[PDB]
Design a protein around this ligand. Sequence first.
Ligand SMILES: Nc1ncnc2c1ncn2[C@@H]1O[C@H](CSCC[C@H](N)C(=O)O)[C@@H](O)[C@H]1O
Ligand SMILES: Nc1ncnc2c1ncn2[C@@H]1O[C@H](CSCC[C@H](N)C(=O)O)[C@@H](O)[C@H]1O
Ligand SMILES: [Mg+2]
Ligand SMILES: [Mg+2]
Lengths: 240, 236
Amino acid sequence: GPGMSIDDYSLVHKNILHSEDLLKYILETSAYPREHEQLKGLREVTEKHEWSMALVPADEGLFLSMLLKLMNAKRTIEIGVYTGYSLLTTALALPEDGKITAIDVNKSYYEIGLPFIQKAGVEHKINFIESEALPVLDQMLEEMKEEDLYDYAFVDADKSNYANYHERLVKLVRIGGAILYDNTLWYGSVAYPEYPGLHPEEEVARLSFRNLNTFLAADPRVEISQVSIGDGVTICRRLY
Amino acid sequence: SIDDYSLVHKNILHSEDLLKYILETSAYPREHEQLKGLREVTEKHEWSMALVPADEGLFLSMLLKLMNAKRTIEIGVYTGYSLLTTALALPEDGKITAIDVNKSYYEIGLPFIQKAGVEHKINFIESEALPVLDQMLEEMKEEDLYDYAFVDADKSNYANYHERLVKLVRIGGAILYDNTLWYGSVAYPEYPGLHPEEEVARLSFRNLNTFLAADPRVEISQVSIGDGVTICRRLY
Ligand SMILES: Nc1ncnc2c1ncn2[C@@H]1O[C@H](CSCC[C@H](N)C(=O)O)[C@@H](O)[C@H]1O
Ligand SMILES: Nc1ncnc2c1ncn2[C@@H]1O[C@H](CSCC[C@H](N)C(=O)O)[C@@H](O)[C@H]1O
Ligand SMILES: [Mg+2]
Ligand SMILES: [Mg+2]
């Protein structure tokens, strides 16, 4: 992936909705008119970037923003930033004193979106950490206190590692807090045990998501809602 | 058992297999036993096309719990699938005002609501929703404003419901409109083969979607789940 080729991914032209016309209707009617001008700018630059397949889309973004506001989130973690579309979405949603821990192995991607984040006036909310996510989460587990738990986590980093992220995040997000997993329908390819013609890295991701979806549905630590928005977003709410 | 409407079996997702995967993997294992029972009786009913689907149900429940909703209003109950979802999501002392013109539909699902132990949270009003909302407006105290409203009744009246509901939910409260993609038929100016009532609803949703996207009193998110759900959050 953007982490560690573009040619290894064979489904980038697929969408989970029944037609591109329906997706374009949602974007033009309901998403783009509500998208911050700096999110638009960041999106348009990123659409030209070689890894644009990884970009969180605008209708999904407004849904993330809505969830953040409805749950009155204040402290969040963003895992897998890329050029920062979902991160800027989060920073604009949070109150003025909101705080985001943002983690990505590749800070050069973040620097593409950083001028839009800065012009949006919300960079002060963001503590960006350039690292693989798991060691950072493991260190947070050692140092965290109960009153500093996160309200919300958005997970959108190495697809094969979501299950390992989950085991840390169910302890780092507060009870009643939210953990969101991005891309859980993987272009619709999760719908079959076997699926033709994927390169090995993409098949690893597809199988990881089939296993994750089954696991999350059985996991008593959370309630879940798998939402057919974007490429599938699974919302988890921590029960205990 | 043949629907008069044209669109009932159309999916907004790209295949029935994809929808089935979501439901079987992520919805049915998480569906309360009484919701399963209520759904299974409703599937055989003449108007089963109107039933809120199980993946949408879990999404409504998640929103209610994440926003810590305590007092809600449900407009368009039918056999009660979304109503029972709401009642199970709310705390033990939660309260719902449920409104439907047809109480006979409610009584189809009421035994399952009762067995779930949540009927006490529900005040069911048999009426057209608009006069009820008009009457609420005249008596509603600011401290009694609803946390959450689910709108799923007469499609052509959604705009009229909105003008009342933006004054009956609290600041920061949620108004959800069901069916705002209308089987995907809203995506085009014209759409052949529809029942006249279906076309009325389709044009109403195209107008509503445009209006909500420009309404300064709310933020919105249109979500491609079920038949489309537009979440509104009241700003002032
Ligand atoms: N092990 C890892 N730890 C942290 N980040 C990782 C990682 N492996 C890959 N990544 C990063 O995960 C990101 C996936 S794309 C993220 C998209 C972004 N959320 C958006 O709003 O568009 C890439 O930026 C990649 O650099
Ligand atoms: N003017 C009106 N006022 C109140 N209810 C109305 C109405 N017109 C139609 N309805 C009701 O709206 C409902 C729409 S179907 C609602 C589905 C239900 N929410 C579910 O979870 O499955 C029907 O029960 C119908 O009787
Ligand atoms: Mg993603
Ligand atoms: Mg409906």
